[PDB]
Enzyme design. Structure first.
Site, mmCIF file in Angstrom:
data_model
loop_
_atom_site.group_PDB
_atom_site.id
_atom_site.type_symbol
_atom_site.label_atom_id
_atom_site.label_comp_id
_atom_site.label_asym_id
_atom_site.label_seq_id
_atom_site.Cartn_x
_atom_site.Cartn_y
_atom_site.Cartn_z
ATOM 1 N N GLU A 183 -3.237 -14.549 14.996
ATOM 2 C CA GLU A 183 -2.968 -13.317 14.255
ATOM 3 C C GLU A 183 -4.126 -12.361 14.531
ATOM 4 O OE1 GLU A 183 -4.713 -13.087 10.720
ATOM 5 O OE2 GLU A 183 -5.866 -14.343 12.075
ATOM 6 N N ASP A 208 6.682 -16.717 16.679
ATOM 7 C CA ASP A 208 6.853 -16.903 18.113
ATOM 8 C C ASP A 208 5.986 -18.063 18.566
ATOM 9 O OD1 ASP A 208 8.274 -14.301 19.278
ATOM 10 O OD2 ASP A 208 6.842 -13.656 17.733
#
Ligand SMILES: Nc1ncnc2c1ncn2[C@@H]1O[C@H](CO)[C@@H](O)[C@H]1O
Ligand SMILES: Nc1ncnc2c1ncn2[C@@H]1O[C@H](CO)[C@@H](O)[C@H]1O
Ligand SMILES: Nc1ncnc2c1ncn2[C@@H]1O[C@H](CO)[C@@H](O)[C@H]1O
Ligand SMILES: Nc1ncnc2c1ncn2[C@@H]1O[C@H](CO)[C@@H](O)[C@H]1O
Ligand SMILES: Nc1ncnc2c1ncn2[C@@H]1O[C@H](CO)[C@@H](O)[C@H]1O
Ligand SMILES: Nc1ncnc2c1ncn2[C@@H]1O[C@H](CO)[C@@H](O)[C@H]1O
Ligand SMILES: [Cl-]
Ligand SMILES: [Cl-]
Ligand SMILES: [Cl-]
Ligand SMILES: [Cl-]
Ligand SMILES: [Cl-]
Ligand SMILES: [Cl-]
Lengths: 239, 239, 239, 239, 239, 239
Positions: A183, A208
């Site tokens: 992230e 994903d």
């Protein structure tokens, strides 16, 4: 014209609860407020970074967007801990994964986050400063998921400054050391909480798989979000 | 549900002009579109990062928000140059200054930007990569301001990851070497333009003097913005 | 024995004009003085680093060698700005190129220069400090070349400490980001000018293509030099 | 026009002896050749960097200038070891000192040199690579000085890229760890000798005490040079 | 309970001789004391890091273990120089080699040591600080080996923090620059000696060739140790 | 002569349990084995680094010394996870503290550890890799202390390479960000566990307050050790 308690937030001092959920997308903050908070009011609109304060099961709770990247979350979280006297922030977000045993739609509870940013070296004389979640926050998230019978992965995130990576060998190293989430924000949040003697954590859902190319559909992302947000909200009752 | 050409932008391919103005605040992008563009339509709403495409004096021009910090602008600008085939981006923004001869409300045209980010070291094998504005863009801004009889400062910016600096000696060094603008984004924009063989520049107005504590009032910021945006718009006609 | 105003320069204070051209080879400084200056006298001979002061089209102008590499130019330029009160230095030199669209004999006007040196990190608390040419100097060079109908490339240089590179991947990265000139000095010059509130720029001619192996002959280098030096001299009249 | 075996040296292959003394000032190289070599001829004039080859007490020996700073010596020494097949280089130079027990006019024999340059990190994967003199060269210098009854200091040098230091705390750290010589070149020479399986060393005389401000007069520098050069020349007979 | 002059050493002040041999394995320190010292007594037992003081050929000499790695030797050596007033430490150890001309069982005398540790950057403002052996110590070792007719390699070591290297390209770079010994401690010892105005050196025997995979048998390691320890002991008589 | 499964450990493969406690002092490992293990045997004696295998309340458990510093623990722990197939290591140790609310004799459970070492940058392409304890291990320690009614501090450690710090500002920064423990090893342990897909944690008792100078007496250290070791042993039953 309204009075500005900070350059980035029109909320009056006292308008934030002591516990705040933050997500990158302000429109998702609005969705959380509209669907899970009672007694809710909008307290910030500056730069479109919507924030709201209300209650969850009677306990004061705020939710606000943080934008994308370490510099953006650092502005908003610094202000929340400093000016608004917030005590606990839980980042709720999405992530990618490279780990061979982590799968799309998994919920990841972050214990610490690495980064390619310099912001933490600048805080510790150039050395390695681990961006570390508060243990009570991690435990509250883990215990809430257990009570809800929602499986979780618990481990390290990596917060990158560069969404569109061109870096050979990065994914292989992240996988080798079992980083579970990729992230862009948690490594900036945790040291700010430390500075203020306050608490922070992070929970994310895998959108994903960076290696296998698997990707959650829109409906799957909504279901993952519903699981993650319920875990986070229930955790706030213990914090 | 609408098709997503990128994870962060709902605009269809072709929906952006080849020339784009970007500012951090999406609400300011809307103001620019509403007051200076014709033939205008909104082309992005994802994450509240409003973007618009129309014309200025008949020439295609888009305007979109970029959020705060290098990681945020890098996402949006990478996508604009790569997916949307944009050729020129001018960042229009606000800044602080430490320079003893730069004053609140001054318009600063950026020739290059330093940074405390690692993103440019990662592009050049760990070495010093100057984030440098395209000369035709700088010249177009300088010449436009001259034609409008608006004075400008021309020189270096510094793009920091940390709005709330705690760094002893930084302001003194920035002043010693005559950095004219302190902001958070331009050092991320210029190398992305380089990667795509495209063009970028930046123009900003001084909101605050970091040393003397002077600060522009809301009305003064509006007047400064009016001067800066007219310079940028007129420059697009030459680019 | 003559009095030494610096350890490296026998020129008396006042013996340098406010505008100085510098090239690495002192023998080329002598050629410039002998062929383009009037009223010329030699003002330095220390370490063979020949320097001269005279006039070009009536305007005071000096020319001096700077040796090879950042540490060498830093000594001479620091002294010129500090002890000799020089206001503008234009480096005139030769370079290699890796850019696919830059060719041997091209004239390159430098807007900023990257480097593998530490000297600029040491000036800015370890951060990225772009070595940036003064805009008035860049513009004077661009406009002079236009008036002379001499095409120019305008963009970034890279100043290396290591002529005999053994560094895998460097040329590919320089080409990817469209660095137009590879040399060894400009990144050291520009920050010294900043420190003194003074001005600097650089113009170079391509002697060699590092990728294709093309190389200018001696006569071609003389013709390239004639074009470049005329651009620089005419630019001094505007500075 | 003469054939160029390197871009920086007009000497024909074979025109350098296997042993070379190098000093920064080419005019000092000429003085050494004129006063200590027999059978001497000038072999390089490019960029005024005079070099000469002859004999000292019958043994082949060359002397050449190297200019100022690591990048300059690296060019010349790389070429000498690579193209000219040189086996041993002794740098003969001047230095400052910060050590409380080292005095102006002292002769310093360098065992290793630190630096603020990046050139040695780039050779060893970013790690600490000590620029180390060859032991046979150090010993030859020490033994030659003993035979001549000339006292010497033996220890570490520091090779800086920045003659005009502005660095708080540097002198105190150098003194704390008993660095005996401050100069600008030896840290670049020793690793190049390593690369070629060849030998290098350095001997310098103290021109200035950086802490106490003591400074050798011109005559004192000549006497110091006479002592140092005799040590170096006698050492070449053992190498 | 006994009084602790340091947290890591139960020896009384004065219980160490001014000259100390140190090896990593405390059991090897005991072997050295039992087989080469007279008048010997054990002076430390803390953490099993055995140390002893006696005489070699009548001259006071101590021997003590130092453990594995820079942090461990730094503790023990700092205390020896500071609290115990030691003047000379010679590290006696084992090493690997990558050099094509160095062989298993060779004795290596270390002139300086590189490292992948940060401890020396932290001592010199982030710059390159060469961990350098004292010349009198190196010479004493070289001369002692000559008198004993034991061949030696003299040159650079590399002190790594990581015994189990996973680092691509490290061995090739070490070989390219003719590092003769790979170990884990000397780069930490030499700068501590510098800090205290004291002396240090290192001698090691090659246990393994890292490239060819050759490895000394137990008996061969004993014979190599006998040669190395005799060199070190004889050297102490000159120090 | 006995067969060596590693250069540093004479234990046969299979001689270590899947769970291991490690402390720096091998003599403390012996004390733990003698007083808390049944079915115990010594399995390593190499370099005096005593290790033992037995049972605690019937469950297989080993205990071994690790020496002082990251390089030392890295050797032993790498071998335990790799050659000996260990699954869980808990470091049991002592530490200092700078935190104003942590006191001598406190038990600290480590969630992550910072460092001034380079070993973790070398694992993650130069970036920030947080040395992070496994959550199940942290939780087992926290829950064991709760059941024993022993208070604990839970938070970050800092693992330094330099026991004898000379670093201005380090303690102030550690206190500002609420690092609770200063030691020398945990930051090296956690990433090795990650590499092997295994688990690690750390628990330490405060021997000294670095700011206030308070220091535990020998008897107080024994009592603190008794509390900490009971927590660790009980935690192994849940791991
Ligand atoms: N693969 C990814 N890489 C980086 N950020 C990601 C990724 N997936 C989701 N995110 C999150 O969403 C945003 C980027 O789309 C960031 O704010 C980040 O927190
Ligand atoms: N003093 C300042 N420091 C950093 N960013 C600034 C400053 N003033 C204005 N900005 C700009 O506005 C935002 C921060 O308020 C950033 O996006 C940045 O570009
Ligand atoms: N390819 C090149 N690499 C580095 N410096 C170069 C190159 N070509 C020309 N130069 C210039 O000429 C000198 C090296 O020959 C340096 O002073 C530098 O400015
Ligand atoms: N104090 C000093 N600092 C740096 N270089 C010095 C000093 N004194 C003498 N030198 C030498 O002389 C030149 C600088 O005058 C350099 O080439 C260097 O080797
Ligand atoms: N190949 C090697 N790499 C690192 N240390 C080594 C090697 N061979 C021997 N040693 C020495 O022995 C120990 C490691 O077994 C370290 O203390 C080190 O000094
Ligand atoms: N203040 C301290 N600093 C560093 N290490 C410490 C400290 N107190 C205890 N230790 C521990 O004990 C040893 C140093 O005495 C190290 O192995 C470390 O883990
Ligand atoms: Cl979100
Ligand atoms: Cl804006
Ligand atoms: Cl030149
Ligand atoms: Cl000289
Ligand atoms: Cl040993
Ligand atoms: Cl212990």
């Amino acid at each position: 014209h309204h009075h500005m308690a900070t350059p980035h937030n029109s909320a009056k001092v006292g308008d934030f609860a002591e516990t705040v959920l933050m997500c990158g997308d302000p429109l998702r903050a609005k969705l959380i407020a509209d669907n899970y908070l009672e007694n809710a009011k909008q307290v910030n609109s500056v730069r479109g970074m919507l924030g709201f304060t209300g209650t969850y099961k009677g306990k004061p709770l705020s939710v606000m967007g943080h934008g994308m990247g370490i510099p953006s979350i650092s502005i908003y979280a610094e202000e929340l801990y400093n000016v608004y006297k917030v005590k606990t922030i839980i980042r709720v977000g999405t992530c990618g994964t490279v780990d061979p045993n982590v799968h799309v739609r998994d919920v990841c509870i972050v214990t610490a986050s690495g980064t390619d940013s310099n912001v933490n070296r600048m805080r510790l004389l150039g050395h390695d400063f681990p961006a570390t979640a508060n243990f009570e926050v991690v435990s509250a998230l883990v215990e809430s998921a257990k009570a809800l019978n929602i499986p979780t992965q618990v481990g390290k995130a990596y917060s990158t400054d560069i969404f569109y990576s061109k870096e050979q060998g990065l994914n292989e190293a992240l996988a080798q050391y079992h980083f579970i989430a990729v992230e862009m924000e948690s490594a900036g949040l945790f040291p700010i909480a430390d500075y203020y003697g306050a608490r922070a954590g992070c929970i994310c859902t895998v959108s994903d798989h960076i290696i296998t190319h698997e990707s959650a559909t829109p409906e799957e992302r909504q279901t993952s979000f519903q699981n993650m947000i319920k875990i986070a909200l229930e955790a706030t009752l213990k914090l």
